[PDB]
User: What shape does this take?
Amino acid sequence: KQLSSKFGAISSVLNDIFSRLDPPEAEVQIDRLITGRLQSLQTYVTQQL
Amino acid sequence: QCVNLTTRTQLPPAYTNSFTRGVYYPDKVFRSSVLHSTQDLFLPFFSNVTWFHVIKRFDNPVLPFNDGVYFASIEKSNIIRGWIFGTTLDSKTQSLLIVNNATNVVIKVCEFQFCNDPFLDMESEFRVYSSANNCTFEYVSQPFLNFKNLREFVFKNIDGYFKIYSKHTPIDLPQGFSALEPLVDLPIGINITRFQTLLALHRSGWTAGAAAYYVGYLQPRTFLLKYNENGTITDAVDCALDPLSETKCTLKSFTVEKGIYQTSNFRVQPTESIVRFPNITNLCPFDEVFNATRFASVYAWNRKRISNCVADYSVLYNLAPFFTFKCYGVSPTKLNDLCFTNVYADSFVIRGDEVRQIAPG
Amino acid sequence: LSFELLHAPATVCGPKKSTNLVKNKCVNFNFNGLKGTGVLTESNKKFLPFQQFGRDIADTTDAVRDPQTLEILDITPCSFGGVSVITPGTNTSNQVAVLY
Amino acid sequence: LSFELLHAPATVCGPKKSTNLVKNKCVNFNFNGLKGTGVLTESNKKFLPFQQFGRDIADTTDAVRDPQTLEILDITPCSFGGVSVITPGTNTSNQVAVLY
Ligand SMILES: *[C@@H]1O[C@H](CO)[C@@H](O)[C@H](O)[C@H]1NC(C)=O
Ligand SMILES: *[C@@H]1O[C@H](CO)[C@@H](O)[C@H](O)[C@H]1NC(C)=O
Ligand SMILES: *[C@@H]1O[C@H](CO)[C@@H](O)[C@H](O)[C@H]1NC(C)=O
Ligand SMILES: *[C@@H]1O[C@H](CO)[C@@H](O)[C@H](O)[C@H]1NC(C)=O
Ligand SMILES: *[C@@H]1O[C@H](CO)[C@@H](O)[C@H](O)[C@H]1NC(C)=O
Ligand SMILES: *[C@@H]1O[C@H](CO)[C@@H](O)[C@H](O)[C@H]1NC(C)=O
Ligand SMILES: *[C@@H]1O[C@H](CO)[C@@H](O)[C@H](O)[C@H]1NC(C)=O
Assistant: This one.
């Protein structure tokens, strides 16, 4: 379910951000989404450990 | 002054292997007893390369390359003299020329006029070009130089930098490892999309000695390189050649222990598009809000809902007949690729002092 | 220009191909402005006429409705996985095995 | 006099190299753009002519050659580290000891 989290971005779909935003802001939104997913996966890894 | 060649004999090019060739220093970093993996244009191992033989066989081919040509040749009596680099090999564009007579090398890039069959010919004849019109570059360096010698050369063009990697060793390609150290860096900063090989003829019509050279293709991939305690490169590992070297690259070690290891994942690459939406019977009348006979004011604009049609955004993004086009919440580059239900076009006239106000918040 | 983008069945697309369905080919596509990569197979789902696209638990598109054809065209039910390498030590030998 | 800004690789630049060097001291040197702090120490290793600056396991500039002088200098950081204080309870006394 964390894949559907917007994480403060315009949309929760990667291809939507890639096709629906200019690259200077598209890279910002992609970086925000991947760091949110990295934080979520770090939390999952800590819980699993 | 150029002389055409008629006695050429037709023969298709041959192919040989690239077992342990094409390795070079990616940068100028000194390391001591560590294994480092880096991304750079590197020749894959066990890749097929083109072999040309000169004997009465004459091999002067023209092939388009962007960058990264690996030139290896077994050499005796200095048959190979010069090289040609450029885009169209004429006076309309700048072309890079390498020459080397019995004294020293000369590196020059110019809009030289190149004939169809340029070559070299005691050597005192120099017939490779006719005139120079638009150039000012000049560079002079020290001379670089049964089969007895093997010469390998790598030419690269990244970020306007012409990197030359050379290595001379005394001796098909022999089975061995030899790291090609860089020789000289040329800050040319032009484009090159063609090359031509120059050969030297012996006069005693004309006779040509036994020579052979190899042409290779450079590909972007990750190589795991080993730097010894004294800084020289000992071995190379391709991370995408075989699963053994894949495990070596993943574990960052040249020796893998016994057991099950995970390196990467298997994926199916896309090949074709099955986009499934039949096109709409009419086109979008974008000229209604652009070529209207009259416009509305900023406080009370005119909204025309444009929907159920096929749009063309090349006149807005690709072409610029208008003063300023800008998109905040949508990509201006991929405007035609998207699919929306309806668009509300607000047409109004604003003075140049307040046109910056049309933005979110 | 204000875009009601990916909130309703879209009708404004410049280039299109309208390719028919194909099996066992997990490749890219673009359905009404939504991009994906997968096979386009059949299903036994009985979709109501007003329904256009379905969604799974992860809010990922798994169904669509194609105008002028009225078919399923399932969204990305294609195979994927990882590859594992099994080999002994380098001192003994160098043979490797590929496992999916 | 006319110039061109952002059109080709640049070679014409003014002199910003501080006109002097440091031996046996850790300073914030600027070697052609990179900024680092360390003591310039003579290195017994042999450096190939094309090499300019080396990197350690930390991917930091631990070795460099001078842009003009052919001599090679190693970058070693000067004295740095944590410091701890050993003291008894405040009710007993107030004498303290410093330890690095
Ligand atoms: C030789 O090169 C050709 C393409 O030029 C390629 O199709 C062929 O597989 C290569 N041979 C080997 C043994 O890889
Ligand atoms: C070799 O070429 C250079 C290029 O300018 C020239 O100056 C030199 O005289 C040449 N040497 C001989 C022996 O012709
Ligand atoms: C002619 O040469 C000058 C100076 O080298 C250069 O700026 C100009 O672009 C050249 N013209 C053409 C058509 O190449
Ligand atoms: C590559 O060469 C072509 C040949 O005319 C030229 O038009 C193009 O500008 C070059 N690319 C770059 C990045 O200069
Ligand atoms: C739409 O597709 C039809 C063919 O089905 C074609 O004739 C027409 O020119 C295309 N353009 C429109 C009307 O969008
Ligand atoms: C209005 O201007 C556009 C762009 O120049 C042109 O294509 C069109 O034919 C003109 N007339 C109308 C009625 O749209
Ligand atoms: C490595 O270099 C040192 C001097 O820098 C030399 O004494 C030593 O012999 C070299 N190693 C080998 C294996 O030759």
Notes: The beta strands of chain D are 26-31, 34-42, 53-54, 63-65, 72-76, 84-86, 97-99.
